[PDB]
Every structure is written in C-alpha cells, then in structure tokens.
C-alpha cells in the first residue's frame, strides 16, 4: 500500500532521509516502480542520482531487506541499454554484487547472480570486468553441491543463465582460463533434468563453440558431444535450437572434431531436423549438413548411408529460401569433395531438377554456388564419358535454357561460369 506507485521524488525523499527504515521503504518503492509491466522509469531513477545510494545499500549486511530491494532495483536498471548498464557498473556495483553471492539469504545472493548476469550480458568488456572482479569462483561455489536437484528451481536457472552470459560474446571471446574454469560445471548442468537449465546450458556451449578450432576443442575435449546429440533429439524446441547450434558450430571445426558428432550418432536425427516444422531448425540443420558435406569422403559417405541425400534433395526442392541456399551449399560442397560414385548417387537421387530450378533465383551468391556444383558434376561425368548424358538431363528440365539466360548475367563471376558451361559441355 505504502510502496505502490511512488513518484521518483518521493523515492528520493525517503532514500535521502536519515532513517534506515525510511530508506528501505523508499528503496522497495523504487523497486516496484522498476518492476511495472512496461516502460519502467530507468532514466528518471538514474538522473535522480539513486544508483550510488542503491550500491551502498548492497553492503548493508545488518539490513538484508534493503540489500535485496536495492539489488532488485539495480538488476532491472542493469537490464536496460548499455548506457543504463554502464550507470550501474560506474556506481561500483560489480564488487558489491560479488560480495552478495556469499549472502546467507538465498534470494539475495540469487539477485546478485541475476544482476551479474545483466552486467555480463551487455558485452565483452563488462563480461571480462565481472570476471576480473572475481565472480566465477563465488558463482561456481553456489553450484558445488552433491545433487543439483536440491537447489531451488529458479535459483538453478539463474546461475545457469548467468554462467551462459559469461560464456557469451566474441570480440574478444571469454578468457581461456575462465572458460576452462566454468566448463566442468557447465558439463554437469548439461545433464540436469530441468529443460530451462538444459536450454541455457546448450546456449552456453553454443557460444563457446562459436569460434576458432582451439575453442571448439576445449569443449569437445570435455566429452559433451554425445549429450548434445541426445538433447538434439529433445522434444522441447528451446533445447533443440541451441543444441543444434552447438553441433553446427562444432562441425565448422576440423574433420576430426566433425567426426565426433558423427560418431555420436548425430546424423540419425537429421531426417527429422531437415523436415522440422520450424523454419529456423530446418535452416540450421541444412547449414550443419553443408559443413558435414565439406568434410572427408568417408564423412560424405556417412551422410549417404544415413539416407540424408534424399532429404537434401527434398530441402533443395521445397523450403524457405534461406534453407534452400544452405542446401545449395551442401550440394556444392558434396560435389566438391565427393567421389565420382558419390556424385553419381547424388544425381540418381534427383539433385538435377531442383538444382536447375534455383538458377532462376534473384541472388548472385546462390547462383555462383549452383553453377559451381553443375561444374563439379560435369567434371565427374567427364571422368565417365557421360558428359553428354548429363547435358541431356540438364537439357530435359530447362537447365541449359537457364544457363544461357545467365550467360548474359551482369555479375563478373557468373556470366563467365555460365559461358564456359555452354561451350565446354554443350553445342
């Protein structure tokens, strides 16, 4: 009743009073203001110069309720723009929040965890500053228990989420030592039964694997690929999405790292992923496939054994344009490193028609890719004297009829590739 709908000035009045209880009430009012459905007056609160006051209340062990209120208020301010988050950091909140992680009051240390999450999530710089202030040990200590299941559901979700932000951002990526520190715990969270924890854990792994092969390696080295393939089959889209991104990232690495997801049985899930109702999953899955077709011939052979070429043909034939483009890539990569027998199989699966149909697309990049593929296939037929038979097939379904049309195309690389095909393989 007395902390509902206060005006910023009343809040300032109470916070500036010489009464701790008056400050507590004013702070709770500030918090409720910052927690209203929409458009919380974050800037008004900031201009009033309240951040420094809140930060100081964080250090009042004697009055844990004001620690909590100011923590919640600061958390919400920190959830705004970079400028608003900067305001919190500039108030000296980082060290103060790290100290609260040790609080005896779970709901208070949890608020500190959340705030640290908002601060780190802003970007690389604040992320690394939080780490430099020593946040990782306290955070990890909060999860150092025999069974994660004994922790409050929300409490676990907040730590997991905050840890995933410490793994987030790329320019630069989190410090290597910090990653190593966090990884073990992350590996444990990846085996927890709560879906939100799994989703955020997968997001964390997806961030760590979004980079150079050395980065992917320290993750693969932890033995999480199998757990990821498992989560890849999850029924909850919020889990499958980040899991698929992690698996997709890992196969952008070395052939050896890519072999790890294959050995884990990832390919068996793709007939489903490649036909997934969610356009995005379908796109990420086809992209993931494209990098797998850019691997060794024995890996392209796995794609073949799992019967995934027909699914690629299917996705090249009908799907969101972005997914089709990813399909084009998977094909051009496949033809590029595949054996003759494998390229013949691709043709036998019906790759030609859908491939030709895309040549009518308004996108110079995809056309280049498709032309490349056409070239790669002809080169395989060249090795069998079947070049002619191929020309017919491409001829049979308006293929040549489209390559000539592009022979006049504007793009440098295009008309060239176009031309060569018309002469070197036709008339």
């Amino acid at each position: 009743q007395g902390t509902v709908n206060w005006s910023v000035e009343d809040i300032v009045k109470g916070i500036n009073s010489n009464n701790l209880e008056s400050q507590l009430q004013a702070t709770q009012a500030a918090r409720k203001l910052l927690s209203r459905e929409k458009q919380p007056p974050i800037d008004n609160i900031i201009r009033a110069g309240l951040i420094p006051k809140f930060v100081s209340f964080l250090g009042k062990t004697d009055c844990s309720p004001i620690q909590f209120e100011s923590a919640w208020a600061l958390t919400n301010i920190a959830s705004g723009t970079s400028e608003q988050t900067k305001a919190v950091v500039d108030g000296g909140a980082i060290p103060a929040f790290i100290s609260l992680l040790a609080s005896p009051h779970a709901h208070i240390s949890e608020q500190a965890v959340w705030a640290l999450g908002n601060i780190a999530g802003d970007g690389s710089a604040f992320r690394d500053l939080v780490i430099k202030h020593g946040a990782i040990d306290p955070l990890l200590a909060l999860l150092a228990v025999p069974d994660l299941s004994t922790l409050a559901c929300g409490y676990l979700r907040n730590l997991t989420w905050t840890l995933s932000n410490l793994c987030r951002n790329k320019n630069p990526a989190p410090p290597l030592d910090a990653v190593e520190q966090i990884l073990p715990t992350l590996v444990r969270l990846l085996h927890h039964n709560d879906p939100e924890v799994l989703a955020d854990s997968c997001w964390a792994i997806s961030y760590l694997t979004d980079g150079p092969n050395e980065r992917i390696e320290m993750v693969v080295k932890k033995g999480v690929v199998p757990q990821l393939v498992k989560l890849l089959g999850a029924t909850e889209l919020p889990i499958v999405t980040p899991a698929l991104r992690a698996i997709g990232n890992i196969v952008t690495g070395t052939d050896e790292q890519t072999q790890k997801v294959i050995d884990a049985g990832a390919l068996a899930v793709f007939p489903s992923l490649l036909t997934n109702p969610k356009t995005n999953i379908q796109k990420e899955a086809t992209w993931t496939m494209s990098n797998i077709t850019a691997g060794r011939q024995d890996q392209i052979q796995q794609v073949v054994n799992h019967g995934l070429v027909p699914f690629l043909v299917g996705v090249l034939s009908k799907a969101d344009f972005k997914t089709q483009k990813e399909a084009a890539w998977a094909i051009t990569n496949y033809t590029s490193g595949g054996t003759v027998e494998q390229i013949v199989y691709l043709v036998h699966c019906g790759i030609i028609e859908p491939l030709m149909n895309l040549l009518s697309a308004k996108d110079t990049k995809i056309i280049q890719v498709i032309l490349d593929a056409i070239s790669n296939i002809f080169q395989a037929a060249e090795k069998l004297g079947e070049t002619e038979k191929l020309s017919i097939m491409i001829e049979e379904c308006g293929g040549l009829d489209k390559i000539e049309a592009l022979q006049r195309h504007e793009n440098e690389s295009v008309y060239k590739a176009s031309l060569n095909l018309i002469e070197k393989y036709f008339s």
């Binding site: 988050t85 196969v251 990098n291």
Partner: peptide, 20 residues
C-alpha cells in the same frame, strides 16, 4: 573450399532480463 562459419542472427537469447 569447405567450412562456413555460423554467421548472422538466430536470434539468440536476450542479452538481459528484467525482473517483473
């Protein structure tokens, strides 16, 4: 030619969370 990095949005999780 080969591996093409994961590039472009997603869009991933929100960077921050306001507590209602």
């Amino acid at each position: 030619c080969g591996k093409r990095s994961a590039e472009g949005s997603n869009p991933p999780k929100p960077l921050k969370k306001l507590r209602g």
